Amino acid sequence: MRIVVTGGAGFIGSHLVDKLVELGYEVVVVDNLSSGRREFVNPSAELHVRDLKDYSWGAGIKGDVVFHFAANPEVRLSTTEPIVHFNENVVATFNVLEWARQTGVRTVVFASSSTVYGDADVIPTPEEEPYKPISVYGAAKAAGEVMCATYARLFGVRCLAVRYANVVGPRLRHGVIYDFIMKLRRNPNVLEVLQRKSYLYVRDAVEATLAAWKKFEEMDAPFLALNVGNVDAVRVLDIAQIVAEVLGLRPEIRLVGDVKYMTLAVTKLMKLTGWRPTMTSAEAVKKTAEDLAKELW
Amino acid sequence: MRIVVTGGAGFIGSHLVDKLVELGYEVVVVDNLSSGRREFVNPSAELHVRDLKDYSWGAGIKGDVVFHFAANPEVRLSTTEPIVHFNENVVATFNVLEWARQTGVRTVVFASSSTVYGDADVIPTPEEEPYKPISVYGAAKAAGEVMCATYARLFGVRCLAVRYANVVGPRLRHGVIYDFIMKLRRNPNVLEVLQRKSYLYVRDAVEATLAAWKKFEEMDAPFLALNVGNVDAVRVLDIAQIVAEVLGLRPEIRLVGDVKYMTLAVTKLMKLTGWRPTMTSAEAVKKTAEDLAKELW
Numbered sequence A, B: 001m002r003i004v005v006t007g008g009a010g011f012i013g014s015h016l017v018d019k020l021v022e023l024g025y026e027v028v029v030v031d032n033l034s035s036g037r038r039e040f041v042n043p044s045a046e047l048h049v050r051d052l053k054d055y056s057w058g059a060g061i062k063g064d065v066v067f068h069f070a071a072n073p074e075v076r077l078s079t080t081e082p083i084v085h086f087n088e089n090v091v092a093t094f095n096v097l098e099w100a101r102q103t104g105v106r107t108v109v110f111a112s113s114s115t116v117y118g119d120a121d122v123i124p125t126p127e128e129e130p131y132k133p134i135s136v137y138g139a140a141k142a143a144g145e146v147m148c149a150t151y152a153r154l155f156g157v158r159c160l161a162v163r164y165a166n167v168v169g170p171r172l173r174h175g176v177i178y179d180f181i182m183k184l185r186r187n188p189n190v191l192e193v194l195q196r197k198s199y200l201y202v203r204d205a206v207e208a209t210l211a212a213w214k215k216f217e218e219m220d221a222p223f224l225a226l227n228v229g230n231v232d233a234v235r236v237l238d239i240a241q242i243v244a245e246v247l248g249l250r251p252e253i254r255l256v257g258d259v260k261y262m263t264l265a266v267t268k269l270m271k272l273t274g275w276r277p278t279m280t281s282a283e284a285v286k287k288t289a290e291d292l293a294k295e296l297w
């Protein structure tokens, strides 16, 4: 079948595209290359440079399933204007749903986020916890989920919403690990750290997403939201230490809408698919620093 | 203080404006006159014809509180294109929140809807029930609430979201009562009916909204969602009968994303404000038919 992956030139999307291609699917990538890169696109995939903010972004594009992963990256949320978060998340997602409805797409796998929970009352956070986002980005992802669930109920466009915790690995060009490497690249002797969160290596995240999608296609529920992340967490200061050692540096650490604590409960995912993380958060962070060192140092 | 009422030239908005004016507030109406009418605007209010779909709709407009009541009317939801529901509800509401944030508005009273609940599992429906909208309009109102609650938590723009059941009274130009009158006007001998819902006379709805707003301004919770509607309900066929009698007609009834059953639990509203409806649903429908008969027959 034909699978459309929006944001397929980006970090998670490009790895997801690689796995779908390895599994034999005909993959179509749609990406505006705002944060993604043509170098990350699998040679076997068909790239279409379109902007999802345009209602007509999908003219001529057909697929049976769409993995809607396009969005501005979840980083430095307070420094981007709210209208950018709104347009790149809510308007883009609505436009994807209208294209899905009008072209008869059967399934939307939406890349959601732990940010829809905001500063959760319960941690590890189960899927039942309410939307209490504290960033415009978080509100935008929650609104996207509400719209997806409604299109599933009303138009039969089924949706699996994957709420990701932090995902890390090769090709990453945003986030705390990338930031620390770039800071040490600027000055290897000092590292400025301005939090405890769960990190999943991208290989694990893609496996979990695809295993969940497979099970979802075997279910008949119109909509399902599922957390995808690791079972543990690491503190920002530990990330800082791991990155330094990978680089063989001994920097002087200097402390100088963002959710402070996050860890999603992944009991539903594990129960539904048998999936298990293959690396701890600390291990996912170390491998990623090693991956990025070769790409950025 | 200065109060801005978007959609103040419309049905609920014009009556809300009348009461705010009667209470002494300086009222500014912003409305694009798409479904509202200049004839409904209180002479004491200041009218600005602007379109909330424009990010800059509020240039030059200042207020301490905004009653955001503008939206396309909640009617014949399945016959309007989804993008219209999306733009008139989600984009407009986001633009109102950005203007509120940038101009330092302290409170947003958002006109939400029973449709955010979809076909509720529990009826009368308490505020705790989840968003399960089945219409794009319902999804749009729920997304609007999520964005409002986030702006309250993040930017301090407090929000009272009023989830209305059906509101009826003078100036109404949409909905089942209006439709039946216009149908009988076309042919007084036959009435085609294509449901059980709660109806509140507009005077009651405006009183409840303002009493809730007063209490909300005395609270410190950033966000509060409150149901506003009657305690009982009437069936479509009863509405049909009431309208006929008001008109002195004896028509032959002929049965030929829309929520089928709705009644909101108003325990929280009554507890918080002491408010009580002054007319039953059947009485609100009869008075409205009498009001509309003079305006339309």
Ligand SMILES: NC(=O)c1ccc[n+]([C@@H]2O[C@H](COP(=O)([O-])OP(=O)(O)OC[C@H]3O[C@@H](n4cnc5c(N)ncnc54)[C@H](O)[C@@H]3O)[C@@H](O)[C@H]2O)c1
Binding pocket: A006, A007, A008, A009, A010, A011, A012, A013, A030, A031, A032, A033, A034, A035, A036, A037, A050, A051, A052, A053, A068, A069, A070, A071, A072, A073, A074, A088, A092, A111, A112, A113, A114, A164, A165, A166, A167, A168
């Ligand atoms: N990486 C994480 O830890 C993480 C965490 C939570 C959620 N997510 C979600 O996963 C998805 C991918 O994130 P990512 O980390 O890979 O970020 P990314 O920036 O690398 O990938 C996003 C891709 O979408 C593309 N894109 C953005 N706007 C577009 C538009 N208007 N039209 C077309 N393409 C557009 C970008 O160019 C980019 O290639 C996003 O939806 C994001 O919210 C990621």
Ligand SMILES: NC(=O)c1ccc[n+]([C@@H]2O[C@H](COP(=O)([O-])OP(=O)(O)OC[C@H]3O[C@@H](n4cnc5c(N)ncnc54)[C@H](O)[C@@H]3O)[C@@H](O)[C@H]2O)c1
Binding pocket: B006, B007, B008, B009, B010, B011, B012, B013, B030, B031, B032, B033, B034, B035, B036, B037, B050, B051, B052, B053, B068, B069, B070, B071, B072, B073, B074, B088, B092, B111, B112, B113, B114, B164, B165, B166, B167, B168
């Ligand atoms: N009447 C009901 O029973 C009911 C039920 C549930 C919710 N509501 C809500 O109450 C509010 C008012 O509804 P109503 O019944 O009075 O409908 P209405 O159509 O009479 O009033 C809506 C007003 O908003 C204005 N408007 C629409 N789009 C606009 C835009 N883009 N820019 C500026 N102005 C715009 C319209 O011209 C109109 O005057 C809405 O938000 C609606 O969802 C009403």
